[PDB]
Amino acid sequence: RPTFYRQELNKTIWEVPERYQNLSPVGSGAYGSVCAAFDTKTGHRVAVKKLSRPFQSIIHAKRTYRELRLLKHMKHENVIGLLDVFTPARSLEEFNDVYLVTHLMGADLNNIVKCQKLTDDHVQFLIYQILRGLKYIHSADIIHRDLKPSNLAVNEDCELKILDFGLARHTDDEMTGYVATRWYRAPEIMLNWMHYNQTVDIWSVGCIMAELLTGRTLFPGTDHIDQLKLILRLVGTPGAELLKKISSESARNYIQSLAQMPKMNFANVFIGANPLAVDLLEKMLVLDSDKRITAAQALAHAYFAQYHDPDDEPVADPYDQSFESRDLLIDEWKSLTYDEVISFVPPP
Ligand SMILES: CCc1cc2c(=O)[nH]cnc2s1
Ligand SMILES: [Cl-]
Ligand SMILES: [Cl-]
Ligand SMILES: [Cl-]
Ligand SMILES: [Cl-]
Ligand SMILES: [Cl-]
Ligand SMILES: [Mg+2]
């Protein structure tokens, strides 16, 4: 067990191994507080996250276990990995606090898509890396659920990592009105007309790719209904074949009240874009979810000819998510989490 030291940073006690030096606050959502630090064992600049109220309720204890399981599994160049996890507790009986350690991320996509000029070669490389990471994630039967520019880290060399997996945490208020939290979501999960499926993530990649090509949000709706009208104007209203599969009686009722619209000509929407970029957008932004291109199929598209290497696009180890259907007490979720903290093995 390492030696730990204590300090107060913005009204919060931080108890951390001596290896982590020069802690300085960087931010705090409702999920916890984050400090930047220098890791003397590895030489990396790291983010240290102290979870807030990790075991306060059954829902919160299960969410803590879910986040730790997911971060311990992810081992891929285009996905955030776990550098360390620790607790100052010396036993289960005194266990209260969990700290998670990752590489410190500077810029997100947002920063480079708003405030920089992107060639077609930059769009090819950035979308290639998102799809390489998503092939790995989907091969473990994981759905990200929250892909958007603020959840994509990018460095000076245009190298990309996916972060901030959906933990099923986003609230109704967070999704209300003129908000980027909703503009990348697939239409079938916008108003919960279908259960989540890995196919919702490819819709999000299409929205991100369109915004890198134009410099503008693709579907900047002022509310859920405005957003659905912008979506159906581009991709068309649901045709005979898709209507048959719309099992939500609420969806058929509102959708059949709208005048029918044909799919638009993407070459006239994305004026001047690479024709191979236009073709790939038409394969991602399909209203019928089962007809969308998959991550594995998209990596083989001719738009990525410069980068595609089928011997360097790895799949994941199997991921057991049977805990998701399990009914446990707060202290049982807390013991499962404790076991995962003490069994952590650091990366090479
Ligand atoms: C209008 C959005 C929808 C797409 C979709 C699908 O792919 N299957 C079933 N229901 C829906 S609603
Ligand atoms: Cl130490
Ligand atoms: Cl990483
Ligand atoms: Cl503790
Ligand atoms: Cl965003
Ligand atoms: Cl597993
Ligand atoms: Mg985020």
Side-chain angles (χ1 to χ4, degrees), residues 143-155 157-168 170-172 174-243 245-259:
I143 311 170
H144 184 288
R145 311 152 175 274
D146 197 28
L147 291 174
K148 56 187 175 174
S150 65
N151 289 341
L152 300 169
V154 183
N155 72 13
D157 301 351
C158 210
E159 297 182 326
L160 177 146
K161 292 188 202 288
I162 297 170
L163 60 126
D164 281 5
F165 282 72
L167 303 182
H170 280 298
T171 196
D172 282 350
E174 276 170 1
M175 293 287 179
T176 299
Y178 189 70
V179 290
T181 52
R182 200 185 61 258
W183 296 337
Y184 305 87
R185 296 205 112 64
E188 65 273 19
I189 53 100
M190 189 110 64
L191 244 12
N192 265 14
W193 290 342
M194 283 306 217
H195 281 320
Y196 279 71
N197 190 99
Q198 67 180 31
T199 58
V200 304
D201 288 333
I202 294 289
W203 183 272
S204 308
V205 178
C207 296
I208 296 164
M209 179 171 167
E211 181 170 341
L212 296 187
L213 294 165
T214 66
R216 301 289 164 202
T217 311
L218 183 57
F219 303 121
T222 62
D223 55 72
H224 292 63
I225 297 309
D226 183 62
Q227 193 173 324
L228 184 63
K229 290 174 176 175
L230 297 175
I231 291 169
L232 299 180
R233 182 170 108 90
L234 180 70
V235 307
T237 49
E241 193 176 342
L242 174 55
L243 197 57
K245 314 173 198 197
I246 301 177
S247 54
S248 171
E249 298 211 3
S250 61
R252 292 220 301 178
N253 283 357
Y254 179 69
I255 293 159
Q256 291 190 278
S257 78
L258 306 179

Side-chain angles (χ1 to χ4, degrees), residues 55-62 64-112 115-116 118-119:
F55 305 115
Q56 66 171 134
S57 77
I58 290 168
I59 299 257
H60 287 97
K62 188 178 180 198
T64 296
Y65 179 75
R66 178 189 296 124
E67 181 172 23
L68 179 56
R69 282 293 307 285
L70 202 296
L71 290 175
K72 285 182 67 177
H73 204 259
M74 296 293 96
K75 300 179 182 194
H76 188 281
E77 296 181 338
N78 306 115
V79 182
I80 189 59
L82 192 59
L83 290 179
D84 196 20
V85 51
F86 64 79
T87 180
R90 302 161 129 108
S91 75
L92 178 60
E93 293 63 41
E94 57 181 58
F95 181 51
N96 287 294
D97 284 329
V98 178
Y99 297 77
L100 299 173
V101 183
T102 61
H103 280 117
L104 187 66
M105 305 289 147
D108 70 21
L109 230 205
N110 260 316
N111 299 321
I112 89 97
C115 340
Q116 197 130 251
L118 299 192
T119 80

Side-chain angles (χ1 to χ4, degrees), residues 69 73 318-321:
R69 282 293 307 285
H73 204 259
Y319 182 65
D320 179 329
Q321 301 197 58

